[PDB]
Amino acid sequence: KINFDIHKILTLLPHRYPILLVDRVLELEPHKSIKALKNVTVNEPFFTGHFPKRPVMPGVLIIEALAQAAALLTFAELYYFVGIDNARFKRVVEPGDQLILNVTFERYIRGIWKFKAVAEVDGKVAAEAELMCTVK
Amino acid sequence: INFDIHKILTLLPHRYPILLVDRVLELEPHKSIKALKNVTVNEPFFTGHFPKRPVMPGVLIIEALAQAAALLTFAEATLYYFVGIDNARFKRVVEPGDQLILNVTFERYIRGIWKFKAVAEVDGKVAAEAELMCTVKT
Amino acid sequence: FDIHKILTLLPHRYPILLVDRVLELEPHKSIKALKNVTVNEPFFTGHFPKRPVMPGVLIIEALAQAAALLTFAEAPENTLYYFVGIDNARFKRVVEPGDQLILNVTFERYIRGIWKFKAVAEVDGKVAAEAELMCTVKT
Amino acid sequence: INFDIHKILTLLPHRYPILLVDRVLELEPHKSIKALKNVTVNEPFFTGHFPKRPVMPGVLIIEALAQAAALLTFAEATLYYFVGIDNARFKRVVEPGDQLILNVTFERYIRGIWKFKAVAEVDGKVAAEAELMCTVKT
Amino acid sequence: NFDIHKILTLLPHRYPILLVDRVLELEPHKSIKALKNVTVNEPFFTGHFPKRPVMPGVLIIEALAQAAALLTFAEAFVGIDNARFKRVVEPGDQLILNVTFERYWKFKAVAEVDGKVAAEAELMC
Amino acid sequence: FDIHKILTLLPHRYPILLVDRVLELEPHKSIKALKNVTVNEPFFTGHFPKRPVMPGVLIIEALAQAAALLTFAEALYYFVGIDNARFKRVVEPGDQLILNVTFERYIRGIWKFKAVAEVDGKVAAEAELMCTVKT
């Protein structure tokens, strides 16, 4: 089980501020599954407008985080979203949460990858979804 | 009905850097909406996505589709949250210069969940399509 | 041509690269370019908080970046672009999120390091702004 | 009359990233003003203009001067609009480290339009000069 | 024990310099344990440093000082001393902000990551 | 020397490069640098929304980068200590922060410095800084 840091991540993904959303890889079973982390703090650029009176992590960004972990899983050992399916959001995610990013490989069919993805906060499920991706 | 960024601002709580609807082109209240989102290289996400080559992140397209949906909800009538996204497919890369036409049609309401069919078009071709489910709180 | 050719020709980057695409190009004579205006632009938070209004000076900036594309095209980080003068600039319409700013620039004259252009920005076939622009190029 | 960024905040609506006047040093009410604008490399435009060589955009010097003109207009007396720029000349490249002295003398008022003579100086030498036409709406 | 929303009502600080995400334990008028999450998606990381992300030391002091204001204004910046930085704080760290009241407003402060001390300092207000 | 030499010597960038210009340099002994303070800086929007105030810790950071400049001038940057830092003035948009940094001692990988930030000739902040350079 491979474990690596934000420095290794930078060499693997083209994503940068303000939309690189994986801080750390905790466990990685190459080409099979990955456990990554995404710290959530009030000091991130979107919180100021989502929402002014009350900070809420945009759910589309939890999906983005997961798809970035999916990409680490692919690239480890540019990225493009092809499909999102069965996305369910089950908790408002806020400043202070750590966002465990669990993603498993499912299939590859002609340059499209299907992944199963779950984001947890404190053992509970915050969101889940099936992601489909391609590189170019 | 049709309105501008100024009415939009009075209807959505979203602000920069994640207010992603510029104009309402048509609103058939409580039924359907065609809204506009201008994509320009002068947006803060393009610097990181991706440094070599600008690409509008697919998820912000979904996000823009949801704010069109909230307008549909809120117009002719408080925070907006996602509960589900199904059958979300991305068919075209969207770039600086494109106008993102945001077509949203209300489908059902059930115990706080609003469901919509959403289609984002650029030049009359489908860039993304998804089914959206959202709720409203506090 | 598109935002990618544009990126290979101009040194300007965020938050001041204000041309998205080139619609028409009569090489060394004139250019019609496009700048999409959206509320998701960093200057709108400050200009103004109550009511988004595209700042007139940035329309001018967009017109001058177009002029520079006219200059650098059919002809990377270290050749820079500078306003030397602006004459006869008139702002006729307020430009807003939603508007597509059509950037029309025609080359008029070059001498001893200065390019003069006649520039007109339009929104929906109506004149938003017009100016005479004088610019130079260094290192 | 000498006042600071705090009085300034009460008189002008402009805010970050386009409030470009830091301090007023001299005000002859409704006739002339000397304001101040600190140029530092920690300003959001410098990263794009230009990467690897900071250059204050000339149009933001024009903007700074116009805000000094707005102050001249609003003090000892609600949005602000550019109507015109004429005879704009840029004589020095302005950089991080330079203090910009914003000199604005009122010149005429005809049917809604204020006109001003404007000069921006760095270290006693002229960085930019221009004639500015402005108007106040809603 | 209280959250970001509560914090927002007690500190005037806002983005990009509000650096307390959550208060884990407060013993009023006496001590506070506070949390500040560190992620690569914070605005300073892009120039500190370009090759290599590294949380500015002075920002850990800022976070501890905010942790200390919370101690002060709940149930209701003049000097730093003996500040030492022992560990580089990085994206992914959960920065635990410990602040005890030591006299009066002086404080002893220790920012811990993963139970190791990241930095420590005396603070006055 | 100017912001352009400064860029060639510090690795720091926006939004945390906080020296605009070096005014005097006694190589390996001392430095007088400049930091322009303007409302158009990213931190002011949050510190504080009502009322701009430059944060005390960013003055320290400015002084520390002046020390980096001093260390690197005629020959990554890490803070190791800060001592006897007092803040004696509220610095505002419009102020020029004069960054006075004297080098004192290098023992065992630690550079030590006395640092003073002045506004309008009067003292704004003063501190002893300990730093070290890695990689």
Q: Are D46 and D90 in contact (CB under 8 A)?
A: no
Write out the H or E segment, with its range, that includes residue C135: strand C126-138
Which of E62, E80, E6, E64 has its CA nearest to residue E31? E64
Conformation bin of residue B65: beta by default, left when phi > 0, alpha when psi is -120 to 50: alpha
Give the distance, in angstroms, between the CA of residue F90 and the centroid of all CA atoms in the same chain: 16
As given in the structure block, the two tokens for residue C91 are 């702002």
Distance separating alpha carbons of residues A50 and B13, to the nearest angstrom: 8
Cα torsion F47, F52, F56, F57 to 10°: value is 40
Burial class of residue C120 (count of CB atoms within 10 Å of its CB; 0-12, 13-18, 19+): middle
b/e per residue, A57-81, with b = 16+ CB within 10 A? Answer: bbbbbbbbbbbbbbbbbbebeebbb
Residue type, F54: M
Instruction: Give the structural domain span for B113.
Output: 1-138
Q: How many CB atoms lie within 10 A of CB C6?
A: 23
In A18-125, where does DSSP find H-type helix?
A: 59-75
Distance separating alpha carbons of residues A110 and E62, to the nearest angstrom: 51
| Residue C78 at interface with chain D, using a CB cutoff of 8 Å | yes
Q: Do B19 and C39 touch (CB under 8 A)?
A: yes
| Residue B94 at interface with chain A, using a CB cutoff of 8 Å | no
Cα angle C50, C127, C104; round to 5: 110
Write out the H or E segment, with its range, that includes residue F114: strand F110-119
Q: Are D65 and D23 in contact (CB under 8 A)?
A: no
Q: Do A19 and B48 touch (CB under 8 A)?
A: yes
Distance separating alpha carbons of residues C76 and F43, to the nearest angstrom: 32
Best E1, E40, E114 residue to mutate vs chain A (most A CBs within 10 Å): E40
Conformation bin of residue D52: beta by default, left when phi > 0, alpha when psi is -120 to 50: left
Q: Which residue of F has its CA nearest to E118?
A: F80
Distance separating alpha carbons of residues E33 and E22, to the nearest angstrom: 9
Cα angle D51, D56, D61; round to 5: 155
Which of B32, B22, B94 has its CA nearest to residue B59? B94
Q: Do C15 and D79 touch (CB under 8 A)?
A: no
Question: How many inter-chain contacts (A to B, CB under 8 Å) are there?
Answer: 107
Distance separating alpha carbons of residues B1 and D121, to the nearest angstrom: 51
What are the beta bridge partners of residue D34? D26, D103
Distance separating alpha carbons of residues E119 and D116, to the nearest angstrom: 55
Q: Are D34 and D101 in contact (CB under 8 A)?
A: yes
Q: Give, in order, the Cα–Cα distances in Å from A122 to each of A99, A125, B63.
A: 8, 8, 26
Q: Do B81 and A61 touch (CB under 8 A)?
A: no
Which of B102, A29, F15, C43 has its CA nearest to residue E15? F15
Best D8, D18, D43 residue to mutate vs chain C (most C CBs within 10 Å): D18
As given in the structure block, the two tokens for residue E57 are 């030391």
The closest CB to that of D49, out of C12, C51, C90, belongs to C12
Distance separating alpha carbons of residues E75 and C32, to the nearest angstrom: 63
Q: Give, in order, the Cα–Cα distances in Å from D46 to each of A136, B108, B120, D62.
A: 32, 49, 35, 16
C48's CB contacts (< 8 A; 6+ apart) are: D13, D14, D15, D79
F107's CB contacts (< 8 A; 6+ apart) are: none
Which of B126, B134, B131, B133 has its CA nearest to residue B87? B131
As given in the structure block, the two tokens for residue F60 are 């320290």
Distance separating alpha carbons of residues D65 and A96, to the nearest angstrom: 44
What are the beta bridge partners of residue D118? D104, D130
As given in the structure block, the two tokens for residue A45 are 């650029």
**CATH code of the domain covering residue C105:** 3.10.129.10
Residues of B marked active site are found at 49
Which of C82, C106, C92 has its CA nearest to residue C59? C92
Residue type, F92: E
Find chains touching chain A: ≥3 CB pairs under 8 Å. Answer: B, E
Q: What DSSP state is assigned to residue B3?
A: B
Q: Are E3 and A94 in contact (CB under 8 A)?
A: yes
Write out the H or E segment, with its range, that includes residue D132: strand D125-137
Conformation bin of residue F59: beta by default, left when phi > 0, alpha when psi is -120 to 50: alpha
Q: How many CB atoms lie within 10 A of CB E76?
A: 7
Distance separating alpha carbons of residues E36 and E30, to the nearest angstrom: 20
CB < 8 Å to C86, chain D = 62, 85, 88, 130
Q: Are B41 and B54 in contact (CB under 8 A)?
A: yes
CB < 8 Å to F81, chain E = 83-85
Helix (H, G, I), strand (E, B) or coil at C127: strand
CB < 8 Å to B16, chain A = 48-49
Q: Give, in order, the Cα–Cα distances in Å from F99 to each of A116, F23, F60, F67, F128.
A: 55, 9, 10, 9, 13
The closest CB to that of B62, out of A51, A60, A78, belongs to A60
Helix (H, G, I), strand (E, B) or coil at F75: coil
| Residue E21 at interface with chain A, using a CB cutoff of 8 Å | yes
Tokens 């023992």 locate to F107
CB < 8 Å to C51, chain B = 6
Write out the H or E segment, with its range, that includes residue D34: strand D32-38
Write out the H or E segment, with its range, that includes residue D88: strand D79-90
Write out the H or E segment, with its range, that includes residue C5: helix C3-9
Contact exists between D and A (3 or more beta carbon pairs < 8 Å): no
Q: Are E86 and E117 in contact (CB under 8 A)?
A: yes
Length of chain A: 136
Q: What DSSP state is assigned to residue A91?
A: S
Q: Do D38 and F96 touch (CB under 8 A)?
A: yes
How near does any CA of chain A get to the CA of E94, in Å? 8
How near does any CA of chain C get to the CA of D10, in Å? 14
Distance separating alpha carbons of residues E108 and E106, to the nearest angstrom: 7
Q: Do B81 and A56 touch (CB under 8 A)?
A: yes
| Residue D64 at interface with chain F, using a CB cutoff of 8 Å | no
Sign of the Cα pseudo-torsion (B47, B49, B51, B54, in order): negative
- How does DSSP assign C40-109, residue by residue? TSTTTTTS-SSS----HHHHHHHHHHHHHHHHHTT---S-EEEEEEEEEEEE-S---TT-EEEEEEEEEE
Write out the H or E segment, with its range, that includes residue F123: strand F122-133
Q: Give, in order, the Cα–Cα distances in Å from F79 to each of C64, E83, F130.
A: 44, 10, 6
Which of F103, F93, F99 has its CA nearest to residue F126? F99
Best C43, C47, C137 residue to mutate vs chain D (most D CBs within 10 Å): C47
B22's CB contacts (< 8 A; 6+ apart) are: B5, B8, B35, B36, B37, B38, C37, C38, C39, C97, C98
| Residue F21 at interface with chain D, using a CB cutoff of 8 Å | yes
Give the distance, in angstroms, between the CA of residue B106 and the centroid of all CA atoms in the same chain: 13
- How does DSSP assign F55-72, residue by residue? -HHHHHHHHHHHHHHHHH
Distance separating alpha carbons of residues D82 and D64, to the nearest angstrom: 12
- How does DSSP assign C13-59, residue by residue? -TTS----EEEEEETTTEEEEEEE--TTSTTTTTS-SSS----HHHH
| Residue E25 at interface with chain A, using a CB cutoff of 8 Å | no
Strand residue runs (E) in chain A:
2-4, 24-29, 33-39, 79-89, 98-108, 113-121, 124-135
Q: Are C67 and B66 in contact (CB under 8 A)?
A: no
Write out the H or E segment, with its range, that includes residue F4: helix F3-9
| Residue A86 at interface with chain B, using a CB cutoff of 8 Å | yes
Q: How many CB atoms lie within 10 A of CB C135?
A: 21
| Residue D78 at interface with chain C, using a CB cutoff of 8 Å | no
Side-chain-side CA neighbours of B42 within 13 Å: the count stands at 27
B42's CB contacts (< 8 A; 6+ apart) are: B96, C14, C15, C16, C17, C18, C38, C41, C42
Q: Are B67 and B20 in contact (CB under 8 A)?
A: yes
Distance separating alpha carbons of residues B121 and B119, to the nearest angstrom: 6
| Residue A24 at interface with chain E, using a CB cutoff of 8 Å | yes
Conformation bin of residue A132: beta by default, left when phi > 0, alpha when psi is -120 to 50: beta
Length of chain B: 138
Q: Do E80 and F85 touch (CB under 8 A)?
A: yes
Q: Are F117 and F59 in contact (CB under 8 A)?
A: yes
Side-chain-side CA neighbours of D62 within 13 Å: the count stands at 31
| Residue F38 at interface with chain D, using a CB cutoff of 8 Å | yes
Q: Are E56 and F61 in contact (CB under 8 A)?
A: yes
- How does DSSP assign B67-123, residue by residue? HHHHHHHHTT--EEEEEEEEEEEE-S---TT-EEEEEEEEEEEETTEEEEEEEEEET
Helix (H, G, I), strand (E, B) or coil at D65: helix
Q: How many CB atoms lie within 10 A of CB B21?
A: 31
Q: Are E125 and E72 in contact (CB under 8 A)?
A: yes
Our count of domains for chain F comes to: 1
Cα R_g (chain D), whole angstroms: 14
Residue type, A6: I
Cα angle E40, E44, E46; round to 5: 65
Give the distance, in angstroms, between the CA of residue B62 and the centroid of all CA atoms in the same chain: 6
Which of E22, E37, E115, E113 has its CA nearest to residue E70? E22
